[model samples]
Target: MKIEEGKLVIWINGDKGYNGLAEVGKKFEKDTGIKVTVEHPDKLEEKFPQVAATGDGPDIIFWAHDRFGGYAQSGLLAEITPDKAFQDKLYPFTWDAVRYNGKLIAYPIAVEALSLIYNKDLLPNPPKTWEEIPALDKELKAKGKSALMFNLQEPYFTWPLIAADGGYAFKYENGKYDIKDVGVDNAGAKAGLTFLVDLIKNKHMNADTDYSIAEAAFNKGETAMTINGPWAWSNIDTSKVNYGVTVLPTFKGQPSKPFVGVLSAGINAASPNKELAKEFLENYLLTDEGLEAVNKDKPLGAVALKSYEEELAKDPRIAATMENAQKGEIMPNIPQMSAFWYAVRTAVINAASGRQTVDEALKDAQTNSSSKTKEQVTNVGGAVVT
Candidate 1:
């Protein structure tokens, strides 16, 4: 447990709370008499492993938890153990995001999940279930407005609806994901996809709607509601749209479960300053004051710290996202997740565009994902490996 002297370096993506973390770094430097360098390099995710393999990586890397599994398995991340009191201060599920093979490899800072965001001016009372969507769509259509809109082909945005009735991308149990047990073609998934396809076929939703279109329409107040996460606040705030965020409506009698994404900080296993990095993270970065500084410029969605709950709940959107995240599924942080994304995206496109029936599309998705998973396992040294 050697501590490197003088300075500690950290890498974070530019758009993901870089400014706020940079401010926190300045405070840490002043308080500890240890220089903190926060770097936001372009393509940090792609370049990190390459640099880490050379044994000259930064002391810390802050990114989404989804990448932690690959990094930890590749020996790029160091396992960390925080004090029990510290561990008890944050949400337990958040820790699940940074765990790999039962080892805690990182510190979760915040969480984000898809929620129902609606323009209050347009929709005085939002629907509470998927069954109400058709009626709302018809009423809005009469006024030349759409009831709801989202990126129709993006699995991330549409996953709540797709998994509304027990569908899952991969079967996860204990601490590992069974990649071979792809469930996109399950009966529940077929039902979910059928619901989506019918929306498009009945002109209730635009099949071609992507993030840009949905976002623009929502911000412009042309749509009553959209399924999105708290990260959209920057633009939504700028647009001055009177919006409210809440949990996604239920499908049939089951609740819609969006994928929850956690943002975390991991220590570089190859760094000589592992102890110092751990000290900064557990004592400084994970604290309420430290996280407040990091979240000042841009809200990091729902912070994991329990102490911050009161303050966070003051913002309805953040409160809603946090509440929704509790009911949502943690996004699987496995290497096979890449295959899940690709296959699901393909299924969404095919099914939504009428190129394939819901059954045919999801069946293809399951097969495609399973094959890709097998390929990943076989070609460990491939050109494009997770």
Candidate 2:
């Protein structure tokens, strides 16, 4: 690592989002004569490629890991292979997330996933497995209480059940996501979708419920449980609600694996100051101080470092989120994933609403997704080979 007497600019999503880092940047400038500036681009993602091309882009960019692949595909992000020791300090799943096309492309900062949020007074005890929900549903509804409600129309909420049952949206082979290998219509997905329908048909749950509705029900103590992520924390009134958060209940002995999303840091491929970017990332970005700065005012999610993970484990608000993420799948960042979400959401909504059978919905979505994804690949970069 070499230190140059030059400026290192970082483009963040917004000034408010990275104000903590802005303070850290000021400290770095003082300690090392290398000046650091943090600025927010109104449309960071859309503006980055053009900016980087002219050699004026920020050396480091802070953003969601899911966007990393799409940028990496367009050659906007640098290939960053951190040392084994540095990589070893992060959670294995976080490492899996920042990789694209057999290369490590970003440094993961934090990870998040949905967990079961419940009202203590309403339920008294949380169900250990989803299998136990039926008995509990009978007991609760008899007393005029709702057992559980979630956003059935959203794929992000529905995917946990599907993945836990061995379903996958895209196939991963040789460290790459094979877009053509769509698995949304597989047996596992059918099983998962059927269970969702059964919940509605049996009157144990409502298919029409979305996050806003379900969260309101929980806040009002009308519902005992809901499936949501850390992002929903601000909506809960802990004192009034007497709430508890935990991992989603296992479905018939299989874990309910949610999608783990990460916020990460990456270097611009077109940066003239790659060495300074690398040195800052390896030294300051992943350190406990910098990691803490990332979520200084609020708990964004779980930090990627082991020691910070231990510290967060004691916090009830973020503990379950971290625990569940360990068992979750990293949300796919590939551009094909955009099509996958629409396909899965349509299938889940159609099937749950009784517009189509589980088999019918999945098959329809798989067929549509295949064609659309193929079209997406063909339209990009002057016709993709695949």
Candidate 3:
């Protein structure tokens, strides 16, 4: 295969893996005689489509998988078909995140989701089910501590409770997400919302706690456990907290699944060297060496590469993240997903704070989000042709 002539440019958002890619780029140039450039662009989600549509953009874009759906729909991204041998080495849900309209649009790198993080010193053994929480809470309370705490207002952190009983932001059928079907208000969803309300009502969790407050409490060992992601490890580690990570305890005999986010890389459809870009991605970026470099610079919470599992498993936090991520539902990538968050936030806060009953809050959320989704769908289809 003749490699295309020209420098391969990659646009990565932020500095998470920038230095590692720069180092890989140097090695790639030496091996293939193809110069590689990795650029860190600000607000890349906003800047990419506008610039790439005009036929002047980087060869590759490395970022979150959520934005690729819009890019794929706009023909801004090129579809990638990795051979079965290559595809078999990554986690299945990672592929689910980048697939749109039954086609693969990007390569998944790392996956992240919320998991149960506890202070080992406070709780000798983490509870395996939600039923064990109440008793644990009572025990901890006697010691002037709480069982668990998290951002009660953020749906992202509380989604596992909602999802445990079949609540979802959007219905995913076949290979695509049906944005029209909002499931957050169903009976099962209400049951989940009720669970959250009880947590606050029973004094098991703080109703006013937000992300920062929850994190602070956990770091100070004021709470026995917290529902958090791998990103929280740095602070906890620096604070010298004795922490243990594990999959979320099952809720009412059903597993709770969090929303999984995947970081991915996709080639720009308008690039002059699509094949070369793909070569770099498949031959280098996806390799164990490439991922190691990236993880070295910024700890990859849970990687999609199956071959790298053994290495990553050495880190207990990443191992627990991987196990929890396997049970997670991929975050919906459709543009209409923007409407679901507001509804969820409103419902969670209102219900937890006693402003509205669980049933009332979820019903309002369903109605509010469904209507907003319809509006977004309509606006996407309604284009002015003058």
Candidate 4:
């Protein structure tokens, strides 16, 4: 791509989400005459560190919320909260997910999430409670099958169970993070984790299996039920199997909650074309023409709250996404989020590996939240003259 005055450069994440995002970019360029140059990993991780070290990078980026906290805390973001467009127009949850130390880091793009998918032939009426899973697991077991499937290794992957048990990771108190509000040790989180672990340990699910293998198993008619999102249907050889789905069991308080993965974009803090880029963004991607581009070929845009309901209603894969998406909460973009993730994932792994009890695993989670860490964080920390 040739350099231009009004053109905006964006770094896109191909691993966490999809590529159709470029559709909106193209429309933005055509409508406003502002160029949008989108690129994938092509050494993305190595590139970011290099940029930070050398003070140069793209004018904008499309990334997951997980990366949000790290960037803002490091002072790499422009702190768009001071910008009028971000302060007022962005959706509440969307804004909250990307704000850290008051910086509205990224503009949310597409949210990838999950829904409770089941085999209609085996489970015409899915259970309404996690307690009911055992009986269902038994019946399927007798038939040499399983009731549900998940990446037991992923906390957000097991999010429905956690929410069903009345558990949450943190509680906001007076507009600030409250350490006393930790939910890892909550009964709900415990129940959620244990249920998943038992399902795998007792053979309700095969611990030996991976996702693609599970997809193959489900498609082969060997598995009677499972948990999945839209992308799972891509390579499905539906030639021999019959299938249908419903929301996960929500008999308790928590509806089978999934994590809402927001897809958004942000202007580069170092970009000289911030003004023109902002104008092009609102005029194109945030309007009817941009919406059309987002939903182009497969009806895949609207993964964010901004476009979810309207876009998903017309597409089956997208419909499944919205079905369970309603049960989820938007992901957080706090600066200390990296540690929280490592801890959350570690707790689940410990439970899966039998290294720690569910109770103990959750207790450890209290140490992972932003509160457990320091408020005065700096990447290039040294002696401070306060």
Clashes of each: 0, 0, 0, 10
How well does candidate 4 match the true structure in TM-score terms? Answer: 0.75
- Clashing residue pairs in candidate 1, if any? none
Models sorted by lDDT, best on top: 1, 3, 2, 4
Local distance difference test, each candidate: 0.82, 0.77, 0.81, 0.64
Clashing pairs in 2: none
- lDDT for 282 in candidate 1 is 79
Candidate 3 similarity to native, TM-score? 0.75
Judged by lDDT against the true structure, how good is candidate 2? Answer: 0.77
Could you give candidate 3's per-residue lDDT for residues 226-297 as a string of tens digits?
998765676787776799889898887788888887989988887778777778888897889998887776
With a 3 Å backbone cut-off (N, CA, C), the pairs that clash in candidate 4 are 107-264, 107-265, 108-263, 108-264, 109-263, 109-264, 110-263, 111-261, 111-303, 160-257
lDDT of 1: 0.82
Question: How far does residue 191 in candidate 4 sit from its true spot (Å)?
Answer: 1.7
User: Per-residue lDDT tens digits of candidate 1, residues 1-386?
Assistant: 23255579999866566777877788878888878888889768767777776566688998889878877877888999788988999989888888888899999988888889999998878999988898899988999998999988678887888888978877877756787887788888888889989989999998999888999999999999998876677678889699888878999788898888898999888777777787788788778888788676667888888888557778878778877887778888876676677889989998999999998988888987776443222223435845
Q: After superposing candidate 2, which stretches have Cα over 4 Å from the reference?
A: 1-64, 81-93, 131-145, 173-180, 201-208, 234-239, 267-285, 293-296, 315-319, 331-335, 368-386
- Give the Å error, residue 142, model 3: 5.5
After aligning candidate 3 to the native by TM-score, how far in Å is the CA of 214 from where it should be?
Answer: 3.3
What is the alpha-carbon lDDT for the whole of candidate 3? 0.81
User: What tens digits encode model 4's per-residue C-alpha lDDT throughout 222-284?
Assistant: 776667655455434333766765666773646777767776666555567767666655555
